[PDB]
Ligand binder design. Structure first.
Ligand SMILES: NC(=O)C1=CN([C@@H]2O[C@H](COP(=O)(O)OP(=O)(O)OC[C@H]3O[C@@H](n4cnc5c(N)ncnc54)[C@H](O)[C@@H]3O)[C@@H](O)[C@H]2O)C=CC1
Ligand SMILES: NC(=O)C1=CN([C@@H]2O[C@H](COP(=O)(O)OP(=O)(O)OC[C@H]3O[C@@H](n4cnc5c(N)ncnc54)[C@H](O)[C@@H]3O)[C@@H](O)[C@H]2O)C=CC1
Ligand SMILES: NC(=O)C1=CN([C@@H]2O[C@H](COP(=O)(O)OP(=O)(O)OC[C@H]3O[C@@H](n4cnc5c(N)ncnc54)[C@H](O)[C@@H]3O)[C@@H](O)[C@H]2O)C=CC1
Ligand SMILES: NC(=O)C1=CN([C@@H]2O[C@H](COP(=O)(O)OP(=O)(O)OC[C@H]3O[C@@H](n4cnc5c(N)ncnc54)[C@H](O)[C@@H]3O)[C@@H](O)[C@H]2O)C=CC1
Lengths: 331, 331, 331, 331
């Protein structure tokens, strides 16, 4: 007898199961950039959002909601309570402290391990079967922390790790060479940030090995100084942060990418972080970035890059370093 | 080892159960345009094809698989045997006889009624929970035939109905008004074909009603002959068939559109073909195009349109053509 | 024998003129949301950003470039100098004066006037053939200021206007109705903000007027009370500002939809802000929101809606006050 | 009194020269597949079709137009007369003689030479400033012919080449490895068809060279017989034509991708067919596939792959044949 009723004759009794649901935890700069790129790539049929800052949270949800006319994600929901979160296929954690200008990512660790103690039990409790994508820094360490607190088998705990570093290196390499990044190939592995490993042997355009063409590639004999390029990758979070206070867009895009392979079962290979005890020389429970095949069940295989001898020693030190820190943590 | 086994180290016992599968039954002109459109709107993580022509079936599948670098649908499969169809969310039927130049859609009924006797029982054996979308002609009778045989509740059996009629209309309108079809509104309802009803009362640009502006919209004594725009719509199939032999591009797009609403659960309203017994002054169980809310459980609500005496008149006549041709059926 | 030349043989000397370039002026939350939305829709082959805050603007530029791999817009540039802006088809202004509390809303305007008296001449100098889209508030006055300063003909100076109020209206409408905003229609015309006009007669789903079904619509004694909806719509950004301190996402999505019409030449109707002396019984040089055909040459036609005469008055009385302000400005 | 003028107030008139136009010459299976793929990737604001069969042509145009509601290319036109082609940025040539009953090769080549002596002058006469993409077979010779009849600079005359060959190879590479083709790289170079060169040295996943991991790769004595894979790629059309009667989909998807790099100015590397006298030791006016930087001005740069003595041998040889057939053509 309502207006609505004179107009829509109903015929089917309404229950709901979201069929392709993503959750972003943390709606700060990174969480919101991840949100917008997911919405614009149509990866979900439900997006849920949680954060402890209630007003910001509800303010961001409405901003996004008022743009539904222009999206094809028919449902956007939010809450402090994880129930809004239930049955997500994918949950992205972007919650936590971030670097002040000058600050290392490692100084972040104690603050964000506490945050994780609280979040991860609540996520795995409403979405027992999700894939977890970890973005908060220091990301390898925090990926491990998510792994341990949750109980999940390890194909299902994923860290973004060097996906960003690698995307920045390919951006700088095309810019040097004058070719789109889509066409410059090249892998940054190991730890996100200070001590990632640039794998010079597999850099190429059109299958054309750059280091075979130019044997000094990335040493100190290099007159054309391709170390400065990795160095520029290393130093970019600091340079962006110093300029605009934080980084948001590049990681949002890079995270939407990772979700795409998850939601569409693509099986593309990404430099992401995973639990690699048993491989690359490593015996501790550490997360580092290595090329991983990513699809609807998380990481199911790992490509076995052929590393030089120092390159495997770079990796082993990071494994040593990460574990010394982890030894000390408490769950 | 194998090359593969030296390159990729496996971590996760593969075990594939499909998440967003679409199946297309009939790989003729319409089936294949649906396939390329669905593939290009990224709506499936898996596409299955069936047909009775083995060679044809497998050359179409191979041809699709080869453009696969430029797609984001990781698995394309086909088979004469319907087990390649198992667990599809949406099965689309585009199998059977089409019109020769000059020929009525309803003249194809008998040949295709028989084809559906073979086809439908096989679909619902492999995909018992699926939504069926019928494209084959006469699409309204065949929708009813798919529903009786299959035994599915009515929400789950959808005729592409007047979705294409409405979209030709909007196109011819915008052409006359100088404005994109996206911005010209107006509905064709009833039978997909000779007895579709133009709802002149609801045509508009921007909320401004066209028959109010110009009262002889839709009668024969109108100086600028707007009635030949619905003349043009019904004659559409017969003109294009006469020129290129069949129609393909427009149905595929139209079909991928409805496919989009279903897989993403948009809940848009389309003029599609549903069992409207009990609604719209109609007491027999026939299918015909009416505005329908379309989501992941199929059709859930119908919009009640205010039709005149005449508009309301044609429908039950549209509705009885199809009637008289229906309970007279051996299946 | 540097490395770029060892690998790549150059066959052509590159006098790059960009073909579908877009500029965004101001890189605050709003402008950086038009930017990422434009970038995600593959509308431009080059994106220029300008702003007087140098570091912020450089940091936002690199944050975007860093995500190049994931975008299809090969060149992003930035500077204080509008020469980076050269050759744009479309220029989007989101810049304006920090807000001056307890101060007349005519010092305020006249201050923006002062920003525009620098901005507008520079944009038009480097992009003579471009199209300006004004978003900065107060949008109708400032659109007027840009028309004045630039000297452009009126079809090429567009205010974002009620574009977003109406997306908001259709969101809240669908929500009350249980249907995608894509399928609800409804127009909010006039002055962006407190003084806008919900056109009740044009509100429909599937061509069925809601005013006619339930003819008390939008009334005070409309027990079923849809002025709520319109009030929500005007209260809309105070509430969001109150919660997150600004609004961005929905304006960026909204502006990116206008950009798409203009860039692809669609000729869809949007409720935007155009100079409409001569129409709607407005005799002053005033920008009001009306339904406009928008395409590659700006706004080329206007849809003449039939207003109730109280609707008319709101509009006339709007122009009266806008003009009372514009007339006191020094230019 | 006209309905159009009671509704729309016109604000400006008819300086209409399209900005991002594309023409497809030839509306057989391939022509139409390039057309649908271009339409669904939104790369043009106008699409024109040409062909000598007038009915088919008209009829395909119309089929497409009825699809407008679901597309965003507001304008589709067609005719036997090349004036509909005026102002194209890209012209795509898919027309040619139907092959015959094993007549000579001169004899196949020259009969398209004769079709091209009509088609090319007409295209350039109306779009003097365009890029030409030739897709017709034999493609490397018919690209030369097109370059020759047209007088264009060689950056602006491009052949399809081994683009689809490489695509098919990566697909098959991917099927063996369990990874999406997007993540498998390898390059088929030289002359299209059986004389093509699979460049074994640069095949890889995540930068790890298959060659170094697997020594006997692309050798006959190869236990795994990866060589049989380049065999499949070169046999692929014979086998697809043998099954379904012709090939369409994969080729049109692959041409739409070249189109995008051209229209969006991406400067990605594709293996396409180019005039390379002066590179790879080539001697005569001849077209061979080579990795090529593709943008808004055609091919501007070329990648120098390090080929084996034997591999240069295959390329230099093709160059000799190409030239032997060419030096006798009649123009
Ligand atoms: N892995 C990578 O490549 C990158 C990582 N990051 C990291 O992302 C993390 C977040 O960064 P931003 O968004 O820039 O900072 P931000 O400060 O804007 O947002 C942090 C958000 O998380 C929220 N939060 C804090 N405790 C919470 C809890 N218990 N539950 C829910 N929400 C909580 C805060 O309320 C705030 O809204 C930082 O750790 C930053 O280091 C940033 C960029 C790149
Ligand atoms: N609803 C609509 O608005 C439209 C409907 N159509 C209809 O679509 C139908 C298909 O037409 P086209 O695609 O042009 O025909 P087509 O003849 O090119 O292809 C039809 C395919 O049906 C297959 N087929 C026949 N029996 C089969 C079975 N038991 N299982 C699997 N496949 C079987 C054939 O082998 C053939 O490949 C026709 O009835 C035509 O009228 C066409 C355009 C629009
Ligand atoms: N009409 C609409 O729907 C809406 C309009 N807006 C308008 O958009 C504008 C942007 O809002 P926010 O981005 O939230 O503000 P914001 O203050 O964070 O940044 C505005 C940007 O303009 C820059 N700017 C100031 N003067 C400039 C100059 N002379 N040249 C170049 N850049 C200059 C500032 O430095 C600042 O980065 C506001 O004026 C607001 O009124 C905002 C929301 C909605
Ligand atoms: N090399 C490559 O990478 C590939 C090339 N191709 C080529 O593309 C075409 C594929 O064949 P189909 O799609 O079956 O097309 P088709 O050759 O069967 O039809 C194209 C149209 O050209 C028309 N035509 C003939 N002369 C004309 C003229 N003077 N002006 C305008 N139109 C004219 C014909 O009437 C015909 O419909 C073939 O010629 C083939 O060589 C096809 C696949 C791959």
């Amino acid at each position: 007898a309502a207006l609505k009723d004179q107009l829509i004759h109903n015929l089917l009794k309404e229950e709901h199961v979201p069929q392709n649901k993503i959750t972003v935890v943390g709606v700060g700069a990174v969480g919101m950039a991840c949100a917008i790129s997911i919405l614009m790539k149509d990866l979900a049929d439900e997006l849920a959002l949680v954060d402890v800052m209630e007003d910001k949270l509800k303010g961001e949800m409405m901003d996004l909601q008022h743009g539904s006319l222009f999206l094809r994600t028919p449902k956007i929901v939010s809450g402090k309570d994880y129930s809004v979160t239930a049955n997500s296929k994918l949950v992205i954690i972007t919650a936590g402290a971030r670097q002040q200008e000058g600050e290392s990512r490692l100084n972040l660790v104690q603050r964000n391990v506490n945050i994780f103690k609280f979040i991860i039990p609540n996520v795995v409790k409403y979405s027992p079967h999700c894939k977890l994508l970890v973005v908060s820094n220091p990301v390898d360490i925090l990926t491990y922390v998510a792994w341990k607190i949750s109980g999940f088998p390890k194909n299902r705990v994923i860290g973004s790790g060097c996906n960003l570093d690698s995307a920045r290196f390919r951006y700088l390499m095309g810019e040097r060479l004058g070719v789109h990044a889509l066409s410059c190939h090249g892998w940054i592995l190991g730890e996100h940030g200070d001590s990632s490993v640039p794998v010079w042997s597999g850099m190429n355009v059109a299958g054309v090995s750059l280091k075979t063409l130019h044997p000094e590639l990335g040493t100190d004999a290099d007159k054309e100084q391709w170390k400065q390029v990795h160095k520029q990758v290393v130093d970019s979070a600091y340079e962006v942060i110093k300029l605009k206070g934080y980084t948001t867009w590049a990681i949002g895009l890079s995270v939407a990418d990772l979700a795409e392979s998850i939601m569409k079962n693509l099986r593309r290979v990404h430099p992401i972080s995973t639990m690699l005890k048993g491989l690359y020389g490593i015996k501790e429970d550490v997360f580092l970035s290595v090329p991983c095949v990513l699809g609807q069940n998380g990481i199911s295989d790992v490509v076995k890059v052929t590393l030089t001898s120092e390159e495997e020693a770079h990796l082993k030190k990071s494994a040593d370093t990460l574990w010394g820190i982890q030894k000390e943590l408490q769950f």
